[PDB]
Amino acid sequence: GNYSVASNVMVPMRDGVRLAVDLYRPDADGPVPVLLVRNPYDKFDVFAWSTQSTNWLEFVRDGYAVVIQDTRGLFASEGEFVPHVDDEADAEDTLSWILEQAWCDGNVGMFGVSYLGVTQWQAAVSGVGGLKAIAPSMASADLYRAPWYGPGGALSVEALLGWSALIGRQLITSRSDARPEDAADFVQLAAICNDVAGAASVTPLAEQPLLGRLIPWVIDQVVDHPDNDESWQSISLFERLGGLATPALITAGWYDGFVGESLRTFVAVKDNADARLVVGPWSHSNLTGRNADRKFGCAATYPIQEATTMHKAFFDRHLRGETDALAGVPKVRLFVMGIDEWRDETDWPLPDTAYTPFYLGGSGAANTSTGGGTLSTSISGTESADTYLYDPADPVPSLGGTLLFHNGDNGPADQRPIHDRDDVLCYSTEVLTDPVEVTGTVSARLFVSSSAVDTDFTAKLVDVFPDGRAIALCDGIVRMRYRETLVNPTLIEAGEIYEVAIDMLATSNVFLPGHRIMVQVSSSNFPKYDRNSNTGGVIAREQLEEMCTAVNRIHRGPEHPSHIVLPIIKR
Amino acid sequence: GNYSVASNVMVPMRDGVRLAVDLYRPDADGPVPVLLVRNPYDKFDVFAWSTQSTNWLEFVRDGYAVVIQDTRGLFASEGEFVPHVDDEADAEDTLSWILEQAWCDGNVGMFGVSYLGVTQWQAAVSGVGGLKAIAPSMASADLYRAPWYGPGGALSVEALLGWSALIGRQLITSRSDARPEDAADFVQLAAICNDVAGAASVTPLAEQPLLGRLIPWVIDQVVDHPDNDESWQSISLFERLGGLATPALITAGWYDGFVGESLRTFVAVKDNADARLVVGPWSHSNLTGRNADRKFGCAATYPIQEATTMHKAFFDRHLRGETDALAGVPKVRLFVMGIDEWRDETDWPLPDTAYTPFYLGGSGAANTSTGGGTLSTSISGTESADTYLYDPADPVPSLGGTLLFHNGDNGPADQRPIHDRDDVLCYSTEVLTDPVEVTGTVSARLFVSSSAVDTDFTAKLVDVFPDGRAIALCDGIVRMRYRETLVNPTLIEAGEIYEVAIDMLATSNVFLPGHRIMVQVSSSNFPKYDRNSNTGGVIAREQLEEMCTAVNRIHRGPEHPSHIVLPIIKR
């Protein structure tokens, strides 16, 4: 139950640069199993992130050592900070160092959330033998797909500016001797904090005299590389995940920006080692289970003690050889919305998932919520088309979903404020008499056409409540140039009909009797995603005045059966 | 920078019962200054409360020892748990014990939030010399006035049931060997968590077969003692605060249930020792500065590092004799809403506070928001009266304010959902052309009359935004039997006109040009307060069917100048 803490122990990397760590070590006779956390937001500040993770001091009382490290160039660590690029090598050297210490019994694990989760995948691919398990929570193994861009090839601009500004504020606040221009830089950073959509609204987007100066990576890496090119593959871990045999306790949230990629990591490692999955109804900044228009119940609050118990059982199994430690612990545990209950599963995706087409249709125009758009499991008998004008100067505002910094505390947002927009097409089933469970990956196949040589298409799945609330579930986007590949974009011919796939990530929701299933289709979702210029140019470099409007069209009927693919579960 | 942690060190009280503590002690040559935290929610679980307090590990790295204690009868501590009653003696014996240890240099301080704040006042009154400073955050020195009842003599029923159930769940979850009936007891407790208004809705209120069994104090002490009698004075610290000379760093929140009493502690100790005040726009469960319909800005987020710095400066001054440590640190720091800025003051109440009457008036009925009720600095020229029916079966629902467990995450709640009720009288100024700052204690003097021999009257101050939002600021209630004294209630004669005072706690808000100042007057605010039966009986014992409706009346004009007293600040 007793332990000691040593601060600012300097660990040398291969290049001579030393990273700072704190050592939480139990009162032990010999060497102990060790847990490593790699953190860019000050290893000293444990309270800021731990509430979203585990009561990990319990690990130390139970005989684990915990090592928390400032990443390179931040706080007590030497070197220069650039996101992602140094973390593979630094983690590898750090694990090596730990394995050489007298207090390490040769078993090392990791845990942490977000960036503290990503860093675990970056550590795992080094193949270091002593690393026996990781527990990456709300993390990604493909930085392009999350959180900076996405599978649809659009820039997550609110994510980028919100985070960069958080790092900027952090760099200024942590400075030894304050520079004179700090205060001015700060006011700009606080302004971004209070109005991320405003900062994302400037054109050209790539012109960030503030953020591009405080942290040049924001432009040099992210904004300047809209294609999933070599710069991105260089830091991507995902393709190497299949070759690994490292157990992973993976945590995600239905409304968390990383959810798509978190789930994909599980699918990629489950066949080669003991993987575990836990998914709750949380967003990045809200793990209470309470939202403005949607309450998931007290049991949906991030169950920190249950997580602590599970992590410990996980580590006891893999770092201490306790063969029975994970007895009774499910492989997959999901919070199933609608019924609003935790439920254990044997796999993700669920076995007996029926990937079911729900076809777009209806008489008249599907524009707005009072239009005639329908969803049905039967193909629409009549060939029609819905048409709207998308104008970059007036994009569809983001409401909930997987937003990170711009109002990222209200995932299951009521969609009624945007229901009357002409560029928001609505399609919904009739009122349900039997519950319909949708749990798994969600995507849409749309037959589309544009007046422009590039544009976007969005799809959002929505649960319509009897009282009128239209609650967002999951959403996705496709940038048409990237409709076939995120690597080698080609433009489109105006007027030509394309079949495009829209990756809407995932969800778990029972649509109860009395509810409707609704899909919203549009061509913007700002600032969750930057807005397409409709020009085929380099979007982030275009002035707004120089962008074009586009007349976009959704085709539906027997020859163009646009549909959403729902993962139907029937029990 | 280095330290060690010892767990479950048993400290013997005067009666032989041993309380458990954890010792966070720096690597030191000799004895060190010590900080004590008394906690009923597991001393091990530091992450749960610390984010609402300080980064206190910084104190340990800087050479302070920190002692965290399980209160009597909870977790690792021996004995039996009853709220409040053992905490004076236990704190005194604990301080004595600390002062006897080899690692204590004879200087002791405390810090903590809520119950961890109350316990500091309970410690301070023991007169132990080694206790040099306390830092009670969102605390009270009068348990009747907060959080269980209030200055108006109404029961804070959502506070009582919400907390009791939290303690109940805690007792079950912490049990060594689970009893068989635990699971059944739990479901009832989780049901209370998800629907506190429902549990508060039962009649008779005093019939709590669950909570009264898990924790009998809920009835034996709280529900059964609606009068501020000897049972309450026995645990009240407030009258002894004047005799103290202990510096206190006092933190409060404008929407926190303890705010009234927190502020009063400052007023009671400021003349005898170095007191400090910090007040932010927070409620108990929401310190983000973000609410459903009201955003206070990133700077309003609980500034945990700035608090840590201030606490440390405070302790360095009073526990380490660093005479200059508090140089540049303001006496009072308020978050002033409206302008939404932090601001330093030299005193609370503010010097040059102009306690200004705003008179009720207007032609026609003031019922609902579309009535004709007015507020004016001139006495209403015409004698009129507003009249409504209050029916206990249909009370005015609580919206924001200082709610604790029932939707306590939305203090500045938009009041429009209750604006059309006939029993909600609205009075407002014309649209403002000049800013009006209201910062200080707020109260109302109403000329009232009832058809009943007892009833309630409520008053709520509201900022009406140009866009229509009617944001709650502070509110209060008066239970008519307690209109003169909370100790010796007398009933009222039906039809007789009384001048009653309604303590509306406090606020700090600039009503900007384009806004209106609004007051809502009614006779219920449920479940923030239990509902008056209108019978003169023992309210908590009455069946709903047996309660009466009351025809209540607000009198206004030259002979009955009902008014709200606003603390006007002009700079």
- Please state the separation of Cα A192 from the chain's center in Å: 21
Which of B 391-410 lie inside 8 A of A, CB atoms? Answer: 409
* CA separation for the pair A358, B182 (Å, rounded): 45
Across the interface, of A46, A193, A290, the residue whose CB is closest to B409 is A290
Nearest C-alpha neighbor of A387 from the set A467, A497, A305, A287: A497
Q: Best mutation site among A8, A47, A294 for testing chain B: the one with the most B CBs within 10 Å?
A: A47
According to DSSP, residue A221 is labeled I
* Chain B: closest CA distance from residue A455 (Å): 33
For each of the domains in chain A, give its residue range(s) and CATH number, in order of start.
2-142+238-345 (3.40.50.1820), 143-237 (1.10.3020.10), 354-571 (2.60.120.260)
Radius of gyration of chain B (CA): 24
State whether residue A298 sits within 8 Å of chain B by CB.
Answer: yes
Q: Is residue A117 within 8 Å of residue A42, measured between CB atoms? A: no
Cα first-last separation, chain A:
46
Query: What gap in Å lies between CA A300 and CA A283, rounded to an integer?
Result: 12
CA distance B77 to B281: 35
Distance (Å, rounded) from C-alpha B569 to C-alpha B251?
22
Give A356 to chain B, closest Cα distance, Å.
Answer: 35
For residue B27, the distance in angstroms to the closest alpha carbon of chain A comes to: 10
Contact A288 B409 (CB under 8 A): yes
Q: What is the rounded (10 degree) CA torsion for B88, B92, B97, B102?
A: 130
Name the β-bridge partners of B69. B21, B38
* Cα–Cα distance, A443 to A506 (Å, whole number): 8
Q: Is B114 a catalytic residue?
A: yes
How far, in Å, CA of A491 to CA of A454, rounded?
A: 6
Distance CA A202, CA A527 (A): 11
Name the active-site residue from A87, A90, A256, A423.
A256
Distance from CA of A227 to the nearest CA of B (A): 33
Contact A44/B50, CB-based, under 8 Å? no
Q: How far apart are CA B211 and CA B217, in angstroms?
A: 9
List of residues 6+ apart from A65 with CB closer than 8 A: A23, A24, A25, A26, A32, A33, A34, A35, A103, A104
| Phi and psi angles of residue A362, each rounded to the nearest 5 degrees, phi first | 115, 155
Residue B445: strand pairing partners: B501, B563
A115 known ligand binder: yes
B555 is catalytic: no
Side chain identity, residue B40: P
Chain B residues touching residue A45 (CB < 8 angstroms):
55
Does the beta carbon of B187 lie under 8 angstroms from any beta carbon of chain A?
Answer: no
The whole-angstrom separation of Cα A258 and Cα A280 is 13
Q: Which of A53, A77, A114, A236 is catalytic?
A: A114
B191: contact with A, CB 8 A cutoff: no
- Comparing CA positions, the residue from B319, B554, B543 lying closest to residue B425 is B554
Q: How is residue A294 written in tokens?
A: 């949607």
Give the Cα separation of A92 and A525 in Å (integer): 39
Q: Does A327 lie at the interface with B, CB-CB under 8 angstroms?
A: no
Technique of determination:
X-ray
Q: B201 an active-site residue?
A: no
A46 neighbourhood in chain B, CB within 8 Å: 47, 57
Contact between residue B67 and residue B59 where contact means Cβ atoms under 8 Å apart: no
The resolution, in Å, is 2.3
Residue B355 annotated in ligand binding = no
Spell out the SS3 assignment of B123-172.
Answer: HHCCCCCCEEEECEECCCCCCHHHHHCCCCCCCCHHHHHHHHHHHHHHHH
Sheet holding A136-137, edge to edge: A112-113, A136-137, A248-255, A275-283, A332-336, A341-345
- Chain B residues near residue A51 by CB distance under 8 angstroms: 47-48, 51
Contact B255, B409 (CB under 8 A): no
